[PDB]
Amino acid sequence: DCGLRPLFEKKSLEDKTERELLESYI
Amino acid sequence: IVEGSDAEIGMSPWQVMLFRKSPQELLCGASLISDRWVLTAAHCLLYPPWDKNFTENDLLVRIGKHSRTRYERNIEKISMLEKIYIHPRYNWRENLDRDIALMKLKKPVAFSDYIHPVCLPDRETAASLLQAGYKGRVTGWGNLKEGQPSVLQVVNLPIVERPVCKDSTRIRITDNMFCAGYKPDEGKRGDACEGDSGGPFVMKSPFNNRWYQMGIVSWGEGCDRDGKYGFYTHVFRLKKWIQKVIDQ
Amino acid sequence: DFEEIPEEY
Ligand SMILES: CN(C)c1cccc2c(S(=O)(=O)N[C@@H](CCCNC(N)=[NH2+])C(=O)N3CCCC[C@@H]3CCC(=O)c3nccs3)cccc12
Ligand code: NA
Ligand code: NA
Numbered sequence A: 001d002c003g004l005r006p007l008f009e010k011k012s013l014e015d016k017t018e019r020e021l022l023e024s025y026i
Numbered sequence B: 001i002v003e004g005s006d007a008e009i010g011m012s013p014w015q016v017m018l019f020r021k022s023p024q025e026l027l028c029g030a031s032l033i034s035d036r037w038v039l040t041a042a043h044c045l046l047y048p049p050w051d052k053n054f055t056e057n058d059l060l061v062r063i064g065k066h067s068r069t070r071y072e073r074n075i076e077k078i079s080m081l082e083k084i085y086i087h088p089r090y091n092w093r094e095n096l097d098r099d100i101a102l103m104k105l106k107k108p109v110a111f112s113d114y115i116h117p118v119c120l121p122d123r124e125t126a127a128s129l130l131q132a133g134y135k136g137r138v139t140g141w142g143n144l145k146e147g148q149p150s151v152l153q154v155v156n157l158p159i160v161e162r163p164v165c166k167d168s169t170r171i172r173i174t175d176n177m178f179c180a181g182y183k184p185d186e187g188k189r190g191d192a193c194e195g196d197s198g199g200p201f202v203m204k205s206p207f208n209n210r211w212y213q214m215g216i217v218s219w220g221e222g223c224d225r226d227g228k229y230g231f232y233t234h235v236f237r238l239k240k241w242i243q244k245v246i247d248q
Numbered sequence C: 001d002f003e004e005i006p007e008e009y
Helices: A018-024 B123-129 B162-166 B235-247
Strands: B015-020 B025-032 B037-040 B059-063 B077-079 B081-086 B101-105 B135-140 B153-158 B177-180 B200-204 B211-217 B230-234
Touching (some): A018 B135, A018 B153, B025 B211, B123 B211, B162 B177, B211 B235
Antiparallel strands (some): B015 B059, B025 B037, B037 B101, B059 B077, B081 B101, B135 B153, B135 B200
């Protein structure tokens, strides 16, 4: 259960800047 | 946090606030890794040079917060500490090597939409994500400039090459540390600042879409200085100590 | 300027 947020991952919503992290990974 | 932005509600549900009982004041950030355990920086608790040594009775843990100063009735939960454990080899005399501490809650906290634990990295997660240029996220209620936010702040920073870390300072850096921040040439700023100590440096796994705590806000020379970088405890390297203390 | 927390704590 760790690291999955109830208001985001658990509802499939993204926060306003997490894309910026993902885009840096590779 | 310097040059950050207001967090969204529930964006960082493992964010913890270390709060002094008297005078009332924010001591540091921290993080929730289980219903009973809190991770933070040893220097939040023990820093002899400045005459700091907090004990269990001195503090409270405030979980599920958003606002820095309001008592968030029905949202936040406040807990008492049962026990504090500092790394036996934390080096406060020289470079804050091993800057890590565990805190055991007197009672387990109940999870909610605002209260949820972050994961601790595995060797392969660390291997995979802890690379120069990759971005992590720091959160906290600390100073806005080297300037007290009303709500939790966030900023995303890229991990920096070891050699660039080493060449920015005179402090002896160890394998238990990593630095993060943009370069002067980079056209982007941001850093942790005072009041941010002990908070989490997180990353989101592209493999399992889970958030992992890679770092702990540790030391820096000021806040957001050109050519300087924020230093963070390397959680994965001290992972065996963590385990050891939760097992035993 | 911290808002007063419950005595309970
Ligand atoms: C020998 N060594 C441990 C050090 C290395 C680099 C800077 C040091 C600073 S400093 O005052 O320039 N930077 C502060 C704040 C950095 C904020 N920025 C950032 N993290 N990017 C610091 O690093 N600290 C780490 C050691 C303890 C003091 C202070 C943290 C503030 C703190 O905990 C408070 N506790 C009392 C008053 S404020 C102060 C003391 C020691 C420092
Ligand atoms: Na150097
Ligand atoms: Na900098």
